[PDB]
Write an enzyme that holds these catalytic residues in place. Sequence first.
Site, PDB file in Angstrom:
ATOM      1  N   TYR A   1       0.839  -1.202   0.000  1.00 26.82           N
ATOM      2  CA  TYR A   1       0.000   0.000   0.000  1.00 26.82           C
ATOM      3  C   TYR A   1       0.872   1.249   0.000  1.00 26.82           C
ATOM      4  CZ  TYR A   1       1.110   0.523   4.938  1.00 26.82           C
ATOM      5  OH  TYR A   1       1.705   0.682   6.158  1.00 26.82           O
TER       6      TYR A   1
ATOM      7  N   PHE B   1       1.644   9.354   4.069  1.00 24.76           N
ATOM      8  CA  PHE B   1       1.868   9.117   5.537  1.00 24.76           C
ATOM      9  C   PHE B   1       2.377   7.697   5.812  1.00 24.76           C
ATOM     10  CE2 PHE B   1      -2.638   8.209   4.901  1.00 24.76           C
ATOM     11  CZ  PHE B   1      -2.774   6.970   5.442  1.00 24.76           C
ATOM     12  N   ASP B   2       2.282   6.805   4.820  1.00 29.76           N
ATOM     13  CA  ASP B   2       2.847   5.467   5.023  1.00 29.76           C
ATOM     14  C   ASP B   2       3.027   4.820   3.661  1.00 29.76           C
ATOM     15  OD1 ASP B   2       3.702   3.113   6.361  1.00 29.76           O
ATOM     16  OD2 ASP B   2       1.942   2.881   7.551  1.00 29.76           O
TER      17      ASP B   2
ATOM     18  N   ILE C   1      -8.030  -0.564   9.798  1.00 30.57           N
ATOM     19  CA  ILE C   1      -9.196   0.311   9.654  1.00 30.57           C
ATOM     20  C   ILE C   1     -10.316  -0.371   8.867  1.00 30.57           C
ATOM     21  CG2 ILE C   1      -7.909   2.464   9.991  1.00 30.57           C
ATOM     22  CD1 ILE C   1      -8.096   2.899   6.938  1.00 30.57           C
TER      23      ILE C   1
ATOM     24  N   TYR D   1      -9.873   6.593  11.097  1.00 28.82           N
ATOM     25  CA  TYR D   1      -9.473   6.841  12.479  1.00 28.82           C
ATOM     26  C   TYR D   1     -10.375   7.864  13.136  1.00 28.82           C
ATOM     27  CZ  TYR D   1      -5.388   4.096  11.557  1.00 28.82           C
ATOM     28  OH  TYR D   1      -4.564   3.029  11.309  1.00 28.82           O
TER      29      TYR D   1
ATOM     30  N   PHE E   1      -5.815   5.678  -0.352  1.00 28.86           N
ATOM     31  CA  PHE E   1      -4.891   4.581  -0.443  1.00 28.86           C
ATOM     32  C   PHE E   1      -4.834   3.978  -1.844  1.00 28.86           C
ATOM     33  CE2 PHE E   1      -6.324   4.526   3.925  1.00 28.86           C
ATOM     34  CZ  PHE E   1      -5.140   4.468   4.605  1.00 28.86           C
TER      35      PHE E   1
END
Lengths: 127, 5
Positions: free
Chosen positions: A45, A55-56, A75, A101, A118
């Site tokens: 991802y 962010f990731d 999530i 979140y 994503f």
Amino acid sequence: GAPATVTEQGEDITSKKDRGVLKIVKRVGNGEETPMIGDKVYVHYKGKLSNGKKFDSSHDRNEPFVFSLGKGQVIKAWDIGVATMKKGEICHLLCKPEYAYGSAGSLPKIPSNATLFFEIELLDFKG
Amino acid sequence: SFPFT
């Protein structure tokens, strides 16, 4: 860009039909089978915030992220979204905070009330 | 932390 496009052109995959998780299939995967509840799923991802920040990313860690599908280990958007994917598929997901979140956010990168984007690749799944 | 919860 891709977040805007899945916002405006994605399909609602929620059972509630509340537009909380929108999806575009970017690369069609293999055959017709999707994973089942409890399967070990292996994904790559990349996640972006609504301010454009990445962010990731699992690619940058040189290992897939692995979890048990449908168990609330990730999530809600991911449980719902990965459950729709075939092996080898790449999709885009646009996730409202109720399926991510929420008001809490997630330190360090994810603010309160954050809509997330994503790109997910389903590498494999197995019972 | 992300990608958990």
